[PDB]
Structure formats: C-alpha cells, structure tokens
Amino acid sequence: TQKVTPALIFAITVATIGSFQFGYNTGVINAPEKIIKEFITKTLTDKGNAPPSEVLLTSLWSLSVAIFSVGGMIGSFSVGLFVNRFGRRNSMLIVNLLAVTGGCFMGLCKVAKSVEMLILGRLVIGLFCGLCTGFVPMYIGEISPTALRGAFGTLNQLGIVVGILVAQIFGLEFILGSEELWPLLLGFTILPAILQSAALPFCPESPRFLLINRKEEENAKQILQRLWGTQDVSQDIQEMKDESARMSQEKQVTVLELFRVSSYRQPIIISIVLQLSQQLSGINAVFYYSTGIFKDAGVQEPIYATIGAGVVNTIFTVVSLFLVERAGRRTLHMIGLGGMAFCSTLMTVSLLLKDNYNGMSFVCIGAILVFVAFFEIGPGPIPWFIVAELFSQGPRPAAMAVAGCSNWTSNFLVGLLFPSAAHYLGAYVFIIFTGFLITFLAFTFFKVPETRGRTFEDITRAFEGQAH
C-alpha cells in the first residue's frame, strides 16, 4: 500500500531537469553551425587576421562541437568525487554553478568577441552534463519505490529526448536560431539550472542515502512517510536497514576494485555492454544520414523532418515507460535490438536500389522512423537506469562512473570514426550495424538477468550465488 505522492513526482521531475540539460546541450549545436561560422569569420577578421578558410572554420567548429564530449567523459567519470562526500541532492545543487558558468561563457562570447569563450563554454557545459548523466539515475534509482524503479528511471531518457527536441525547435531561424539571437539559444541552458536550484531545496535527499550512508534512521523514516503518503513504511525501512548492514560489512569500492572483485565483474560487464548496445546500435548513423535522405526525398527544409523524428523519438520513450515494469528489461531491450536490426537491413537495401527504382527515398524514411521507435523501446532508456539496479549501495557510485564514462566515450569515438567508415563502406555501413545488433541481442538473451521488481538485496545475492 503505497500511492505515488505529488512530493515524490516533484522530486524526480526536478532531478530530471538534469536530463533535459544533457539533451538540450547535445542537440542545440547542429542548427546554428553556419551562423556561428560567420561569427568566427567576423571576430577574427575584426581583430586583424586574414579571413579564415573553410578548412580553418571546419576545424574551429569541429572543436566547438567535440569538446563537449571530452567534458562529458571527464564529468561522468568524476561522479564518485561528489555523491558520497556531498550526498546526491546536494551534488546537484553544487554543479549548477558549472551550468551557469558554461552557459555564461557561451551566451556572452559574441558581445565579448571571443571564440575562445564559446569553446571554453562548451567544455564547461560538458563537464556539467557528464556529472548530470550520473547524478540523476543514482538519485532516481535510490528514491524510487521498488515496483516503479524502471518506470521512474525512464523519465531520465524522456528528459533527454525532450531536451533534444526543444533544442531543435528553438534553433529554427524565427525562434532563437538567428544571427542576432543564437547567443540566447546557447545561453538558454542557464535558465533550467536557475530553475532547478530554486526547486532542489524542496526535494529531500533520498531516505536510502540518509539511512545507509549517514545512519540517520528516524529522519529517513519521516522523509519516506511523506514521499510514499503512508506511515507504515516497515518492510522498506528494514530492507534499507539490511542494505545498511550489508554496506558496513563491505570495504567500499574504487573503479579498479570493480574489476578485481568477482561478484562485481559480470554486473560491470553487463553495465558496459548495455552502453555499447546503445551507442553502437546504429542510431548515430541514422541521424547522420537522415538529413541527407530527407533532402534527397523532396523536403527542401529538412529541419522539420528532423523535428518530426524527434516527436517520434518522444512518443516511443513514453511507450517504454509504460511497458518496462510488466514486460521487463530483457524483453524491451531485445525487442529494440532486433527491431533495429531489421530496419538497418532495409536501409542498406533501400539505398542500394535508390535511383534505379525511384520510390526508395520514402522507404528509407519509413525505415529511419521505425528505427527510432525501436531504439526508444529499450536500448535508449534502459542502459541509463539499469546500472543503478545491478549494484548495492557501496559499489554503485564507482560502477556508474565507469558505465557513464563508457557511454560518453563510445559516443565520442563513434562520432569521430564514422565519417571515414561511411566514406569507404557507403550504404554497407548499416550492415556492420546490423551485425552489432544481432550480437548485442545474443548477449542480452544469454547474459542479462531480469531485474524488474526485485530488491537490490535480491539482485546482489543472485550475482553472488553465480560467482560462487
């Protein structure tokens, strides 16, 4: 007997402002490219350099884009420097200083005639976003009622995709995507941060962290009673007491220790492979090629098809949210991997028959949109919250620094190496991705145990049994 209280929904929603931040900053950079390149040309040339070549502009732009990922790699790997020392909620209150700072660098670089400020600002917003992708699932995972852990955990990915969609809408030239307003398109990131710092004082630190890491039992119990809307919180205080007992019997874990301890090695392998199943799914290739295929299919301003694909992107994230607690994690993730595997084959075949049987441009659009649906059914939301469920309280931060960093790093290497691969492979690049997908589908079938509705204590014991 536990309803969902307005206070619990408020807490998790405010935390997922971090997710919206990650989505917005990831997706905001593409639309203003040419406006910002003219800005770079004007800035240099007014400081007395010769006008930059295309080569130089491509170079400086590419650095603006990419230095975000470098920040995200670092930020996410450092989550373990914050969450135990400051607590989960307080950590969020602290790193908003980074968000406001990076948003100011980006938002002010034009009136300050500074290309360096734009780049610096993209790195600092990257550090911020990396810390977010680790803080938000840890908080959500630790305060959620056990039967709603994955559902609430899906709001993370929903926050991300909505952030992306809003970044693209704002980037329209009649909104903020203009030569006069692109600083506000970029600086916009400080408003959600300002909004989250105002609201975070009304969000409790999770009763789990309070009881387990700070041994504050009777104050954890009072938080719990309000979040749940009931006063019988008995089963659940002690399960937390069981985790507290468990944690005081364990040496807690460094990143290196995850890999030497045997009880951890397969949870951490599941954790990382699931991140690769997300970033090597082919989803990147689909967005890359997407704008090109649209223009080719008679859509003379293809940003609206990109926005339309974001709408689809959002729809099927909610679909997953409603399915994840009944269907399970295994089922939703493998449905995704196989559904994608089918679509990337149809893309290779479409593109190869394209200007010989001419209708194929629409076929390839159908495949792209069906791909996005299958991505959000499982491989999108699940890798972001599952790591929190595979570990007990003590190892969780280090585990989520590793899993989070491997998500950003694989994303970075993919964005780096794919243009070459596509150049030599052409349309056959969707066939290597079909090959990854089948392999990940195999991996999930044999290696990933079901975690839906199970306590941390019963998930951990099963991993310990197997290691025995």
Ligand X SMILES: OC[C@H]1O[C@H](O[C@H]2[C@H](O)[C@@H](O)[C@@H](O)O[C@@H]2CO)[C@H](O)[C@@H](O)[C@@H]1O
Interaction between residue 146 and ligand OLC (CB under 6 A): no
Interaction between residue 308 and ligand OLC (CB under 6 A): no
Q: Of 221, 29, 239, nearest to 125 (Cα)?
A: 29
Give the count of alpha carbons within 13 A of 175, CB side only: 14
> Rounded to whole angstroms, how far apart are CA atoms 436 and 341?
9
Interaction between residue 160 and ligand X (CB under 6 A): yes
Residues 262, 408: contact at Cβ < 8 Å? no
Pick the closer one to ligand OLC by CB: 29 or 390: 390
Interaction between residue 155 and ligand X (CB under 6 A): no
Stretch that binds ligand X, among 70-78, 154-162, 297-305, 398-406 (CB under 6 A): 154-162
Interaction between residue 277 and ligand X (CB under 6 A): no
Interaction between residue 392 and ligand OLC (CB under 6 A): no
> Rounded to whole angstroms, how far apart are CA atoms 456 and 247?
12
Interaction between residue 315 and ligand OLC (CB under 6 A): yes
Pick the closer one to ligand OLC by CB: 244 or 392: 392
> Rounded to whole angstroms, how far apart are CA atoms 18 and 132?
5
384 is in an annotated binding site: yes
Chosen from ligand X, ligand OLC, none, partner binding at 466 (C-beta under 5 to 8 Å by type)? ligand OLC
Interaction between residue 303 and ligand X (CB under 6 A): no
> Rounded to whole angstroms, how far apart are CA atoms 280 and 270?
15
> Rounded to whole angstroms, how far apart are CA atoms 43 and 143?
49
Q: State the sign of the Cα–Cα–Cα–Cα dihedral 430, 435, 440, 442.
A: positive
Chosen from ligand X, ligand OLC, none, partner binding at 145 (C-beta under 5 to 8 Å by type)? none
Interaction between residue 391 and ligand OLC (CB under 6 A): no
325 is in an annotated binding site: no
Interaction between residue 263 and ligand X (CB under 6 A): no
Pick the closer one to ligand X by CB: 277 or 278: 278
Chosen from ligand OLC, ligand X, none, partner binding at 463 (C-beta under 5 to 8 Å by type)? ligand OLC
Distance linking the first and last C-alpha atoms of the chain = 36
How many other C-beta atoms lie within 10 A of the C-beta of residue 423?
Answer: 9
Q: Which residues ranging from 311 to 370 are in contact with ligand X (CB under 6 A)?
A: 313
Residues 427, 352: contact at Cβ < 8 Å? yes
356 is in an annotated binding site: no
Interaction between residue 458 and ligand OLC (CB under 6 A): yes
Stretch that binds ligand OLC, among 35-43, 107-115, 392-400, 455-463 (CB under 6 A): 455-463
With tokens 């240099």, the residue in question is: 44
Pick the closer one to ligand OLC by CB: 179 or 242: 242
Interaction between residue 466 and ligand OLC (CB under 6 A): yes
Interaction between residue 32 and ligand X (CB under 6 A): no
Structure tokens at 66: 């990419």
How many other C-beta atoms lie within 10 A of the C-beta of residue 37?
Answer: 17
Chosen from ligand X, ligand OLC, none, partner binding at 161 (C-beta under 5 to 8 Å by type)? ligand X
Angle ∠(87,92,95) on CA atoms, nearest 5: 115
Interaction between residue 171 and ligand X (CB under 6 A): no
Interaction between residue 287 and ligand X (CB under 6 A): yes
Torsion, Cα of 258, 259, 261, 266 (10° steps): 90
Per-residue interface string for the shown chain with ligand OLC, residues 317-336, x marking contact by CB under 6 A: -xx--x--------------
Pick the closer one to ligand OLC by CB: 68 or 456: 456
> Rounded to whole angstroms, how far apart are CA atoms 233 and 264?
30
- Please spell the DSSP secondary structure of 51-100, one letter per residue: PPPHHHHHHHHHHHHHHHHHHHHHHHHTGGGTTTTT-HHHHHHHHHHHHH
Compute CA distances 201 → 11, 14, 40, 309, 341, whole Å. 10, 10, 41, 36, 45
54 is in an annotated binding site: no
30 is in an annotated binding site: no
Interaction between residue 284 and ligand X (CB under 6 A): yes
Interaction between residue 468 and ligand OLC (CB under 6 A): no
278 is in an annotated binding site: yes
For ligand X, the binding residue among 31, 44, 138, 161 (CB under 6 A) is 161
For ligand X, the binding residue among 18, 27, 177, 404 (CB under 6 A) is 27
> Rounded to whole angstroms, how far apart are CA atoms 161 and 339?
20
Total number of residues shown for the chain: 468
Residues flagged as binding site: 157, 278-279, 284, 313, 376, 384
Q: Applying CB under 6 A, which residues contact ligand OLC? A: 162, 314-315, 318-319, 322, 445-451, 454, 458-459, 462-463, 466
Residues flagged as binding site for D-glucose: 157, 278-279, 284, 313, 376, 384
